[PDB]
Amino acid sequence: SNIFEMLRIDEGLRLKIYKNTEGYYTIGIGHLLTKSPSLNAAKSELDKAITNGVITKDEAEKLFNQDVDAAVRGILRNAKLKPVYDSLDAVRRAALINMVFQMGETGVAGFTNSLRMLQQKRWDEAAVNLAKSRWYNQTPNRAKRVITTFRTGTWDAYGSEANKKFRQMFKPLAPNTRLITDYFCYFHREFPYQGRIYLSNTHLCFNSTVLNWMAKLQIPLNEIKYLDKVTTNSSAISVETVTNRYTFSGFIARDEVFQLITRVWSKE
Structure with a gap:
């Protein structure tokens, strides 16, 4: 913006x-x-x-x-x-x-x-x-x-209603944070948590929609080191930070999510 x-x-x-x-x-x-x-x-x-x-x-x-x-x-x-x-x-x-x-x-x-x-x-x-x-x-x-x-x-004040909810769901992120898009996927923890991954100019965020199993993850894009398409799972992207490795699967259009994430990530 x-x-x-x-x-x-x-x-x-x-x-x-x-x-x-x-x-x-x-x-x-x-x-x-x-x-x-x-x-x-x-x-x-x-x-x-x-x-x-x-x-x-x-x-x-x-x-x-x-x-x-x-x-x-x-x-x-x-x-x-x-x-x-x-x-x-x-x-x-x-x-x-x-x-x-x-x-x-x-x-x-x-x-x-x-x-x-x-x-x-x-x-x-x-x-x-x-x-x-x-x-x-x-x-x-x-x-x-x-x-x-x-x-x-x-x-x-200049964002969509989806940006507003995104901002309320993960607080406070960065002052200049804008929501770009969001995708259904599973976050792999001790089991695969159904939910949504949120791509923003600053952050990659995940929220669990598994009833009774709330879990959230905020990853600043500038803490992401590696961004890999998982070899053995075509629907799956793995994210490697300073301090951890996170795997998400179940993407409808995985390679489309991967190119976009890579482009937004290159910026920051």
């Missing part, structure tokens, strides 16, 4: 010129065209920005990539925002970029106490403070989502 995915969710792709949460005409993934009331300005500035008429996904996320970078440049050249932005982890940096993208560097720079609270890691206090704003009142659901990001340090 780059800042890009986070912003397409909050802005929505729109190949034709619409209106934002105000009468200000807008295009693409949140590109403010003008604050004038009537569409003269509108596609004056569109062709000035791009091709005529309205826009294709090529150019929509071409304005978008310009504007993300312009939000980040505004932060780094602003004496209030940079030290906050420097102090923050990658996740809450995306939340700050999100705010600056929506409001401009000047609007965000106005939050002098909240920015200070963020800088000293006082997340809860920053959150109640940010929720007293006109910004919260004008777009409460987007605000609730970025504030939750500031509050938690995670991407959960």
Whole structure:
């Protein structure tokens, strides 16, 4: 979850010129065209920005990539925002970029106490403070989502309901942990425990669905040394850590699970 995915969710792709949460005409993934009331300005500035008429996904996320970078440049050249932005982890940096993208560097720079609270890691206090704003009142659901990001340090407010359950099932994992996919399999302990293996950008996790036999396993991907397709069992992958060897079988599509795990694992 780059800042890009986070912003397409909050802005929505729109190949034709619409209106934002105000009468200000807008295009693409949140590109403010003008604050004038009537569409003269509108596609004056569109062709000035791009091709005529309205826009294709090529150019929509071409304005978008310009504007993300312009939000980040505004932060780094602003004496209030940079030290906050420097102090923050990658996740809450995306939340700050999100705010600056929506409001401009000047609007965000106005939050002098909240920015200070963020800088000293006082997340809860920053959150109640940010929720007293006109910004919260004008777009409460987007605000609730970025504030939750500031509050938690995670991407959960932008995740699927399956990501939410995954996160509740194995806590707390890493701040930037996102669920990728999950598969039925058996974990081989003193017997084969039916359950589910969860692949995330940071962790390989397993939960037992054998009634009366609960068992969980969390394996950070950066503790995995070897990742082998078991020679004598076509449905089975074995995972070797710093400290242990774990075998899972019963995969519907084993070689597909194995390539994906290998790819996600190479990253981390």
